């Protein structure tokens, strides 16, 4: 029961890592 | 400024992003499949498949893997009870993990099209607009569906290269997974013949391949083209929702009425067997056949399997459930521990006073005692004042035959009324109302909940089909009438409603 909560939290942290890496705002110039 | 209920209308005319959201939907469905498979493995108990089957536990997606032949896990246990040595790649956990890998792969496939949606396939090469050739797309998809249908029917069903499907004893004792011989005569339409399911897809995929190549080659008429608005896309959605809810009533009806697709050893019984009196008639015939040989009662009744006597019980009838009685039949009234045996109720003379079985509608049916003919000879009175046919006044004893409490006899009315109220239900089983903390009221089955979901969603897709069938045809007047509706709304002057053939 709580193992699913643990796994959901770890997978959600990894998903936010994924979206932060790839779907960021482009750092744009002048 | 769009309303909230039409925000997906920005991808009516963006087909790469349409493919992206098709992929994301497919990934979510596969993710549910894998997660529900893993959760159901983690909840599932393989401890005794004789008295604790899959359908008592509320198990849902595992009797589909077991239906199509996945009969082994990585723990070494199997379904029928013994252990098998080699699990191979394809066990239950392997199927679940494969669906999780599909979910991730289709996620990463879904990202690419909406990142790069503006290629040159989705461009009409003649004149330079963004269209798509719907009859040829339909020919491709129908050809693919025919190929997969034919391959599934030829190889995986009949055991040419696949392992086969669950084909069971009709009396529900000795079912197993088997390669199926496809029958081509008139018995292929009897739905209790798995050879019919085998010979189905062989013809179905071939005819689908033929029709798919037909639509790849030929092109439709302008008459049907404007009559169905085949240049539009949403007519395909309106037709597809129609086909889907036509399929839904079929898969609900076969699930509810029972077929070769839904075995009783994977879904429990059906409700019609109860009021037809199926298992009771079979048990009494197989008892009288042994008693006519010369055998006695205590060794005649003690030859009936518990997996036969367990379906003679109203708690496994899936029509005694409840909408908000959540959970499973174990949490309903316990776990099947013991079978006490058949009970007989004898008066002061020796007549076997029968007990009237409970019908389906009646939640609290009162306890009567029939004779051999149908005349009531005793009862359990609701009112205790002027009772004439009470068991305390008559003196009905009970004798057991077979089961755990074999060779026993009771005369005390406080126990006779208890076993009368329990033998009203069918056969007598001793349960465990302590471990899973049951409440003693009955639940429904995965045969029931599937039927409920697939008739409710069918009835909702009916309305969705009516809405899209209206909104496909009425595209020009989608957001209001024009300013110049003519004086053709008169009664009798214009002798035709708007059409200009002969006024």
């Amino acid at each position: 029961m709580e193992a699913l909560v643990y796994t959901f939290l770890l997978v959600g942290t990894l998903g936010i890592i994924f979206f932060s890496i790839f779907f960021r705002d482009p750092p744009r110039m002048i | 400024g769009l309303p909230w209920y039409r925000v997906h209308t920005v991808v009516i005319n963006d087909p790469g992003r349409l493919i992206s959201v098709h992929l994301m939907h497919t990934a979510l469905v596969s993710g549910w499949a894998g997660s529900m498979a893993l959760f159901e493995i983690s909840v599932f108990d393989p401890s005794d498949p004789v008295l604790n089957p899959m359908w008592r536990q509320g198990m849902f997606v595992l009797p589909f893997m077991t239906r199509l032949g996945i009969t082994q896990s990585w723990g070494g246990w199997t379904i029928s009870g013994e252990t098998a040595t080699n699990p191979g790649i394809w066990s239950y956990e392997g199927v679940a993990a494969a669906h999780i890998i599909l979910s991730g792969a289709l996620f990463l496939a879904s990202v690419w099209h909406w990142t790069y949606w503006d290629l040159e396939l989705f461009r009409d090469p003649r004149t330079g607009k963004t269209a798509l050739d719907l009859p040829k797309i339909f020919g491709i998809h129908l050809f693919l569906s025919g190929l997969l249908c034919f391959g599934f029917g030829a190889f995986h069903v009949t055991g040419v290269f696949g392992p086969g499907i669950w084909v069971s004893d009709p009396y529900g004792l000795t079912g197993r997974v088997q390669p199926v011989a496809p029958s081509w005569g008139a018995d292929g339409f009897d739905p209790y013949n798995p050879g019919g399911i085998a010979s189905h897809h062989i013809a179905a995929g071939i005819l689908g391949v033929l029709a798919g190549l037909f639509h790849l080659c030929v092109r439709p008429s302008i008459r049907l083209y404007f009559g169905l608005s085949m240049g539009s896309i949403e007519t395909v959605l309106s037709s597809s929702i129609a086909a889907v809810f036509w399929a839904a009533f079929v898969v609900a009806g076969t699930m509810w009425y029972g077929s070769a697709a839904t075995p009783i050893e994977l879904f429990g019984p059906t409700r019609y067997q109860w009021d037809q009196g199926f298992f009771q008639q079979e048990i009494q015939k197989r008892v009288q056949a042994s008693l006519a040989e010369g055998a006695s009662l205590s060794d005649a009744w003690s030859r009936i399997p518990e997996k036969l006597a367990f379906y003679d019980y109203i708690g496994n009838n899936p029509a005694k459930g409840g909408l908000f009685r959540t959970g499973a039949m174990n949490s309903g009234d316990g776990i099947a521990v013991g079978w006490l045996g058949h009970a007989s109720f004898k008066d002061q003379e020796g007549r076997e006073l029968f007990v009237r079985r409970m019908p389906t509608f009646f939640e609290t049916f009162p306890v009567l005692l029939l004779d051999k003919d149908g005349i009531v000879r005793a009862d359990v009175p609701f009112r205790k004042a002027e009772s004439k046919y009470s068991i305390e006044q008559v003196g009905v004893s009970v004798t057991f035959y077979g089961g755990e409490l074999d060779g026993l006899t009771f005369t005390d009315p406080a126990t006779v009324k208890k076993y009368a109220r329990k033998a009203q239900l069918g056969e007598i089983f001793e349960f465990d109302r302590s471990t899973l903390q049951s409440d003693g009221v009955f639940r429904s089955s995965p045969r029931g909940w599937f039927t409920f979901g697939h008739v409710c969603f069918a009835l909702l897709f009916f309305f969705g089909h009516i809405w899209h069938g209206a909104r496909t045809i009425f595209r020009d007047v989608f957001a209001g009438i024009d300013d110049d509706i003519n004086d053709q709304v008169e009664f009798g002057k214009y002798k035709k409603l708007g059409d200009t053939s002969s006024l």
Binding site: - | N13, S229, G480
Partner: protein
């Protein structure tokens, strides 16, 4: 030998109907176009595209090859 009860090798043209107004930014979208184009006089010239080279099926320049290979 002059064998067409069906006429599957006929030189018949194909009425071309344009795409409808599928731009839902504005009101009053419309439908297809009836007798619009000059109906695209069919040709059986073999192209270079590895998927569907002949660009039409109903023609002698496919059916001769299909009959010979079969």
């Amino acid at each position: 030998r002059g064998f067409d009860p069906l006429g599957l090798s006929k030189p018949s043209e194909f009425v071309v109907i344009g795409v409808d107004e599928n731009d839902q930014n504005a009101a009053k979208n419309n439908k297809g176009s009836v007798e619009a184009i000059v109906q695209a006089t069919p040709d059986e010239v073999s192209s270079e595209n590895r998927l569907a080279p002949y660009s039409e099926v109903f023609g002698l320049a496919r059916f001769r090859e299909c009959e010979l290979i079969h």
